[PDB]
Amino acid sequence: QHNWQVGNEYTYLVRSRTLTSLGDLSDVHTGILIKALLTVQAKDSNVLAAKVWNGQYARVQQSMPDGWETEISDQMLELRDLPISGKPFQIRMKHGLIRDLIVDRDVPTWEVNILKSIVGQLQVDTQGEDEPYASFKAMEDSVGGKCEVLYDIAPLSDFVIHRSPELVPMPTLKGDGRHMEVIKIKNFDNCDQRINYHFGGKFFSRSSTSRIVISESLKHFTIQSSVTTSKMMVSPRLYDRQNGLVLSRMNLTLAKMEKTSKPLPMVDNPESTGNLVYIYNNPFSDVEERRVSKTAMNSNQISSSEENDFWQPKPTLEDAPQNSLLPNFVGYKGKHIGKSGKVDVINAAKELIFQIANELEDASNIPVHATLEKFMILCNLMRTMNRKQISELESNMQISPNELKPNDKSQVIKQNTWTVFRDAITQTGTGPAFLTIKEWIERGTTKSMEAANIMSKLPKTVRTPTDSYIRSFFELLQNPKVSNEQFLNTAATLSFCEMIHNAQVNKRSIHNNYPVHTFGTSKHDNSLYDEYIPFLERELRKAHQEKDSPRIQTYIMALGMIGEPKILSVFEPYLEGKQQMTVFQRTLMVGSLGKLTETNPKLARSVLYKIYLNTMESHEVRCTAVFLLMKTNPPLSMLQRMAEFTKLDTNRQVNSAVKSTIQSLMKLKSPEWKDLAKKARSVNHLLTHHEYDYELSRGYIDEKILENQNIITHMILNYVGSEDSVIPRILYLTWYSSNGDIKVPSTKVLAMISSVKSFMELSLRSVKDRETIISAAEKIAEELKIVPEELVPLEGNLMINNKYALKFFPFDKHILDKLPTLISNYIEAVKEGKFMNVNMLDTYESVHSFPTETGLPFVYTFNVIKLTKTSGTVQAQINPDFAFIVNSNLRLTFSKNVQGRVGFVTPFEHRHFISGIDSNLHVYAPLKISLDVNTPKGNMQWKIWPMKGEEKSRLFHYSVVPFVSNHDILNLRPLSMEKGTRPMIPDDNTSLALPKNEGPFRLNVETAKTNEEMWELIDTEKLTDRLPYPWTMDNERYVKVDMYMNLEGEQKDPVIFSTSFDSKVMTRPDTDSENWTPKMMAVEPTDKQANSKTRRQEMMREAGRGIESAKSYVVDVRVHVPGESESETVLTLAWSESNVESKGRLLGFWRVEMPRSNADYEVCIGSQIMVSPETLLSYDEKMDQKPKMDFNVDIRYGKNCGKGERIDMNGKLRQSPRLKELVGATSIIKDCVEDMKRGNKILRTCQKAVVLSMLLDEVDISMEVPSDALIALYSQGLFSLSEIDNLDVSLDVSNPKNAGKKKIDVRAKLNEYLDKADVIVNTPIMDAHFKDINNVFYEDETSCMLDKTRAQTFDGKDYPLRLGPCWHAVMTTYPRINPDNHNEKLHIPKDKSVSVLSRENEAGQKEVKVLLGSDKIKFVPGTTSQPEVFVNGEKIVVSRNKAYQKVEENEIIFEIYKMGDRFIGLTSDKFDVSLALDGERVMLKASEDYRYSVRGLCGNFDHDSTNDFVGPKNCLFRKPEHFVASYALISNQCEGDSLNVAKSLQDHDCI
Ligand SMILES: *[C@@H]1O[C@H](CO)[C@@H](O[C@@H]2O[C@H](CO)[C@@H](O[C@@H]3O[C@H](CO[C@H]4O[C@H](CO)[C@@H](O)[C@H](O)[C@@H]4O)[C@@H](O)[C@H](O[C@H]4O[C@H](CO)[C@@H](O)[C@H](O)[C@@H]4O)[C@@H]3O)[C@H](O)[C@H]2NC(C)=O)[C@H](O)[C@H]1NC(C)=O
Incomplete structure (x- = not known):
């Protein structure tokens, strides 16, 4: 492995470049070039002498049509002088590759990084971990880090050398060998030592390639060239197409090869710099200091507390944090920006705050002044200050909002100064900032709302959550000025828990959301558990003792939000039952386990399943358990058991929830729920066929994938149905959207309420109207001795969570009690005048950084700033x-x-x-x-x-x-x-x-x-x-x-917007029943002005004539816009309805005027809808009397309403004989055929069967259109509809269906069984043919049947029945407990006092007594084809063409009318009840308002068919005879039988 032969003197020319461009959008390129010379001498066997001198550089910003690799001549450049401390440094070799460098006292760390890059450009591996070919992988190192590289070695042909001689400048060392080439490719997904600063694969496409030429291998290496190329592709706004490029390159090429002449001077100040990776420094030290770690590991042969790599020290609460990559921290030659002295930090902050405050008054010029960017610059500047500097600035500002006048108009700039300074302190997120906030709150500069708003933004702004930071925060939390208040206390505790969770609880949050690499919560620091968990435990116990709902809600939510398994041991003395707890608190505790599922899914899944199994628990708890359970990715067995349990489970709410949640996991197709879609599809064949309504619990998951941009958008919405009213109790809403490995933070909402009805009753109490009048209802309730249910406290929550703030608002009875007082106080506060000034400034930040291959930092930012x-x-x-x-x-x-x-x-x-x-x-x-x-x-x-x-x-x-x-x-x-x-x-x-x-x-x-x-x-x-x-x-x-x-010449003409409303009840001669013509005509009112009483009266009259007991409504709207062209507008609507006969009409009138252009347009509408069969209950299987439904729609428009284009649209429906056959051959028909043979009259099954019997199959819609433009528009719409996926493609035929007649008919057949419809369209322009609950009369699931030998309840119970001679109570209203006093009782509301008394005649007939507030009605059966009707001890006649009305203050009290064969009716609008009898059977209809507020034979009306056998003493019964006996008045006309049964029941034990 011999190379760099001893005694020789080399010389390499150095070139490098770094450019940044906007990708495909343009060709401009910003960056720098560098030129230098490197001389290396072989001092001894393992130590070499090097030097980098003759440094020059230039900056370029110009178009590069050819590419970023284009050579630029030195004449076109603008060379400069590189501040390089040219000194004879030294380099040492360690058995092959290069190991460490040596530097002198002139050691700016950036210069050392550049030198490290130049050195590492010579990195080679001749051997692995003749033979021209070779290939392997090595765990090599460079400036970027120690990521692994892939090698490849092969000789280079002479043709390439001849073509491009630059690769081989001087070739005279071929010798007995030849010239080779090495290609190294480095991946960045597996490394050892890394430098980065991440806050806020991850759209970071990195690359690295090399090329080195060689001589005779393994014995005379002789590097002769080396080129490295790197790229970085990144998306600017996190939803883009990667137009952000950062490119780099380094070049070395041999120049000289000759004998050494003079040895380079020895370095006199050894400064070992370690390996080639980037090394940090101190941005504030006057004397240069560096953190270089020398492991000096023996190696050879073949987070945890360890030395690992050198990291910057953790800052304290007074000193500023130390970063070595951000522009502000190492801009000035590796030091802090203010060290220069050309800028003073305090003065710059002062000018910035003054500018922002001044410009925030003239809001119309905010975009042109770039105020929000100035705010960001100020925040970045204050991130570098220390505690003394911010204290000095606070003193210098001479500002104290306590002395300021809150409502003054003069000190607007001063208030703005305070606001901007406070916002900047909140957004700084450093130790000094928190010390300032602690000083503010402790001494009392921000009392409640400002402090809570400040701490609502801390958990999502702090940069480096340290241990002493959290200790100080806890010490502040233990202060009497925060604990005693409520809203500040809850905000502070929630922020504490959130920051604890992010900082320590989740290791993924530590690794991703925080820069661990640049800074290294110790494992030995077990202070979390012992110091913090007992605090929350003890204070939650104390809050539970005091019985304070907001405190309990806050602390349960906090302990849930910490997100550790120890919260299970915290809660297990609560959920199990050792401590009493309300349903609201229980459901909050169950829902608080959301964070535990995302960390330890299996244990949370086990707990939630075990909660689900139990049935005796409340349904809201079980529902919430279900929703949390199916966010855990369960196996197939769990879902199979879920589906199996669906069929056999009695609770409607839980069944609805589980069915909806299972069915909602189907339409998804995305690589995050994919594995659950198959399991969801493998369950339907086990689900119950029953389909539930919407008032029950449901679930819904939405998906929106955009493969063009790889964008995934979701939405989760859940609700638990209420047991008292339509509006659901609980709500969830999440909008998590992920596109890649980095996503915008989630948005969550959570609303909760104990009882909607109780909440509305308490909120609406501010009317100063307590009932005092006592009616017969309270006497009835007292004599029966009705005890009301134990009232439940009112509690509520509202939580919002997004990128900016985390908020929480726990409710209570006291808060709602205080609401009217605050409302009134504000009322007299705004009596004369009140100025205000409100500003909100919240921001989001994200910074990612890592060194480039040229030895320079790379920084990416993403800011959003929002002002209100x-x-x-x-x-x-x-x-x-x-x-x-x-x-x-x-x-x-x-x-x-x-x-x-x-x-x-x-x-x-x-x-x-x-x-x-x-x-x-x-x-x-x-x-x-x-x-x-x-x-x-x-x-x-x-x-x-x-x-x-x-x-x-x-x-x-x-x-x-x-x-x-x-x-x-x-x-x-x-x-x-x-x-x-x-x-x-x-x-x-x-x-x-x-x-x-x-x-x-x-x-x-x-x-x-x-x-x-x-x-x-x-x-x-x-x-x-x-x-x-x-x-x-x-x-x-x-x-x-x-x-x-463009409004000039100040105008005093308002833009007005008026509205009105009215009602009436039609008098006697108008509803003569002879005024109903089958076809209507639009009426043209005589008065066309705005908000006219005459038009209202005329429309109301013409809308209700011919309908018995009809009520007409009207809504009048006016819009007025003045100016160079005035625009008046008039709009009126009217409609009618009656409880006697199904006969409704609608009318409308629109008109706009243009006084300047003299343009007038109008339109009048007249419509009616009638269903021919009168409402009736029994099957009446004899004969057919087929149903009919006809309606008319008539329009007319133009300059004058009367004369102009009038459309005569007529429709008609029908039922086909095929449905006669189907009805005659269906199950329910035979069912109540047998029942009527037995004698059943008004049972549920054939009430549904007659509902089906009143069904309409054929549709005959015809419209005569006198306008061809309307025909063309309809043709365009028809083509658009045919463009739909399901609709068959039908084009215009050669022979039109109709010529010379304007009509479009649509009809759907009955044989399709409503799986899909076929719609024929026959227009004169185009002909189309397509390929293949309802109207009900006086029947619904609400009602309660009371038949001769049967009884159907409100919720659907059936039981044997037999009445007696003395009166029984069917439906009653009973007084409740006063929320203010647990001893006194309230009174029946004036509009909700109803008592219904029944009776059985000795001859098998029935008598009916109803107590309608202060009135009573008796129904003597008789034998005169209709039961005798006496009103208030006086006889009234009910016939075919008359009816009874009680009218007062233009409102209807009750209606008595004759219907059917032997039926008469009582429908109370003021009381929302309905009744019908025939002397042999009565059926009772109620309204939704009576939920949980009625008690009688029918039941408690709670949407539950299990507990409707409850007596006056709130005791469940077990025999229909016992129930009928129990609910019997014993006043008079009764002796024995029922009386004896009641006496025995009183003597006996109930349940
Ligand atoms: C790493 O760094 C080295 C050092 O600069 C780079 O090596 C240079 O590579 C370029 C490649 O373009 C070389 O430029 C070439 O120079 C040749 C010789 O120049 C003489 O002759 C020209 C006239 O042709 C005179 O003007 C000049 O003053 C010299 O006297 C040229 O002949 C080449 O011409 C090319 O373009 C013409 C266009 O018609 C073609 O016809 C030619 O065939 C040829 O392709 C060319 O200009 C440069 O000399 C090299 N520097 C050296 C050897 O010191 C590496 O490229 C760089 N690595 C990279 C960028 O990856």
Whole structure:
């Protein structure tokens, strides 16, 4: 392995280059070139003498059409002098490859790195780990690190040498050997020592190649050339096509080969620099110091605490952190930026803060001043300060917000100064910053909201979480000024837990999100467990003792968020049952186990499964367990057992949850859920056929893959159904999107509530209306001795988590109690006037760095800055009649700036070369608002003004600009104003002024002549069709837009927006039933003004005539826009409905006026829908009486509504005889055929069967279109519909279906069984033929049947039945417990007092008594073809053409009417109940409001068919006879039988 023969003198010419460019977008290239000479002398066997002298360099920024390898002549260059400390250093050889270098006192570490690169360019391996061929792999080292390389050796032909003689300058050493070539390829995925700074495969495509020429092998090596080439491909904005390039090269070539003349001087100050990898330094020491590690391992022969590699020391809480790669830390010759003295750190920060504060008042010019970039520069600058400097700056600012006036208008700049300084301190993320925050809070400069907002942003800003940092944070957490308050305390504890988790709990978080390589939580530091877990344990126990809900929620969430298995031992005395706990707290504890599944999936899966198995637990807990269980990748056996259990499980909610979650894992196709898709598909054949509604628990996973950009976007949404109301209780929402190995952080939401009904009742209590009137309902409840259920406390959560902040808001009863007081206080606060100034500034950061192959740092950044600003005076005046008058003078602004940059930094010149793209968004709202709301009259009048002094201000600005830059690091200014920055305006650029006429708005869009996408989307108002089509809009190319306001000559004419509302009940002669003509006509009102009572009355009258007991509604809207061309607008709607007969009508009226252009347009609509068969319950299998459904739609429009294009659209439906055959040959038909033979009347099964019996198959839609343009539009729509995947392709036939007649008919057959439909389309222009619950009458799952010998409950229970002579209570409402006092009871609400009393006649008939608040009704059966109807002890007649109404204050109390063969009805609108009887059977219909608030024979109405046998004493029953006996009044007309049974039941023991 002999090489570098002793006594000889060599000489190698040195060339190298490093360039940064923007890839395919342009050809400009920014970078430097280097020239030098290297002389090596063979001093002895193992020590060589070297020297690098004659250093020159030049900087280049020019177009390179040929490529980055183009030779540039020295005449075209601008050579400089390289600050190289040319001294006779030395190099030593160790049995082959080079081992270590020697440097003198003139040791700037960057110079040593460059020398290391030059040395390592000579690295060769003649042997492995004649024979011209050879190949193997070696674990070699270089400047970048010790990554492995692949070798390849082969001789080089003479033709190549003859063609290109440069590879072999002087060939006279062929001798007995020849010339070879070596190719080395290095991969970076397997290394030993690495240098990097990562914060925030990973879109980092690296490469390395070499080429060395040789002489006679293994005995006379004689290196003669060496070329290394490296690339780095990176995406700028994390969603791009890799246009970011950083390229490098190093060149060596032999020049001289001759005898030594004079030995080089010996180095007098040995400074061993170790191996060839990059080495850090100290950025603050006045005397140069380096951290070089010399392992000196014997080797030979064939994280853990070890020396490993040299790392920078961990900084303290007072000293600044030490980094050796960022521009600010090693810009000035490897030292900190302020060491130069040309910049003073404190003064620069002061000027930056003053500029930012001053420019933040004139918000319309934020984009042109680059304020947000200035904020980022200030944050970077303050990342280098120490504690004394920030303290001195705070003293020098002469600012203290405590002395400031919060609502003053004079000290706007001072308040802005405080705000910007506070935001910068929050975003700095260093030890001194946290010390400053501790000093602020401890002495009391930020009391509650500011402090909590500050600590909500800490967990996602801190750079290096050290041990002493966390210890100080804990010491602050143990301060009385933080614990006693609530919102600050919860924010601080959550931030503590999150930072602990990130810093130590997850090793992946340590390795990825933090720069471990540049800085080396020790394993021996077991302080976490002992110091922290007992703290949270003890304080959670104390909070549980005190019975304080927000504290319990906060501390459970924190202990869950720490994410370690010890939380299981923490919780096991809680979940098991040793400590009492509410359902809300239990579900929060179960949901808190989310972080444990992502770290130790198996143990969390076991715990969640064990929770799931139990059935006696609450359904919300089980549901949440299911959702957490199927995010763990279970095996096939688990899911098989899941599906098997689905069928046999009684709980509807859990079944719905598991079925939905299993079924939702199917449409996915992506390499992260792929392994579970097959298992999901292998389960359907075990699932239950029953399909559940939407009010129950469900799951949904969404996928959106874009193979063009390799973008994966997800969404998870879960909810647990509520047992009291429609609105679900719990909600989850996650938007994690990953494209590669690095992804944007996840966004999560979690909302929870104990009970929706209780929450609404407490929130709406601010009405000052406590019920006092007592009706018969409370007497009924008291005599039955009804005890209400034990009330549950109200609790709630709301958590938001995203890139910026982590927030948490635990609810309580006390907070909702305090809400009205704060509302009132704010009400008199805004009585006269109140100024405000609110600013939010949050940012996101990510920096990645690693040395290049030329010996220079490479830094990549990605910043986004978000601003939200409000300012103005708001005044309100509230009156007891709700005369809510508000005047506001606000200004609104929103801006965003995202910028990604790639490049490198050269320490010896303090310069920075960058290529990247940045974008700006900006919106401004200088508006005045006047709001007058008068709620008794339904008026909602707005007035909007253009704010004075903002006649011509920017309203919109979007600009995307790519650039290349070459800027000094000492200067602290935005790069847009630097001289070296060059934008890349495309060659073919044209401007554009969108408004062709001088309208109120101006738009100025400029871009390249190409980009036809935006060039058509933006300005082309002609092709305004299929224009939006949300796409990416090629955001990687130059664009800039701006929209001003052209309003000049300040105007006092408001833009108004009015609204109204009304209702009425139609009087006697209008509903004469002779006014219903089969076809309607649109009505033209006599009055066409805005918000007119006459039009409302006319429409309401014409909408309800001919319908018995019909209610008409109306909604009137007005919009007014003044200016050079006024635009009035009138819109009215009307509709009718009645509970007696299915006969509804709709009407509309639209009209806009243009007083300047004299343009008037109108449209009138009149429609009706009727279903021919009257509502009926029983099967009535005799005869058919086939169902019918006809409707009419009529429109008319033009300058005058009456005279103009009128469309007469008529429709009709039908049921085919094939469905007669199917119904006559179906299961349910025979089922209740046998039942009616037995005598069953209103059972559930054939209620569903008659529901099917009232089904419609054929559809006959016809429309007469007098406009050919409408026909053409319909033809275009038909072609578009035929373009769909499922729709068959049908074209225009030679013979049109119809000629001279305008009509399109569509019909779907019945034999398809609604699996798919066939739709025929017959237009005069095109003919198309396609290839292959519902309407219900007075029946739903809600109702409760009460038949002669059967009983169907609210929730679906059946049991034997037999009544008696004395009254029984069917449906009742009972009073509850006062939330304020656990002794007093509240009263029945005025609009929810109902009692229903039944009876069995001695002759088999039935009697009905209903207590409707303060009224009573009795239904004597009789034998007069209808049960006798007495109202309040007075007789009323019910006939075919009359009906009973009780009307008060234009509201309906109850309706009595005759229907069917022997049926009469009672539907209470004010009470939301319905009843029907025939003297032999009664069925009861309720509303959703009565959930968990009724008790009687029907049941408790809880969507549960298991616990509907509960008595007044809240005791479950076990025999229908026992239940019927129990729920029986014993007042009068009763003796024995039921009385004896009730006496025995009282004597006996229930359950
Ligand atoms: C690592 O570093 C070394 C050191 O520079 C590089 O080696 C150089 O390689 C270039 C390759 O282009 C050499 O340039 C060549 O020089 C030849 C000799 O130059 C004499 O003759 C020309 C007239 O032809 C005179 O103008 C000049 O002053 C000299 O007197 C030229 O003949 C070559 O011409 C090429 O282009 C013409 C175009 O028509 C062709 O016809 C030719 O056939 C030929 O291809 C060429 O210009 C340069 O001399 C080398 N320097 C040396 C040997 O010291 C390595 O390239 C570099 N490694 C890299 C870049 O990977």
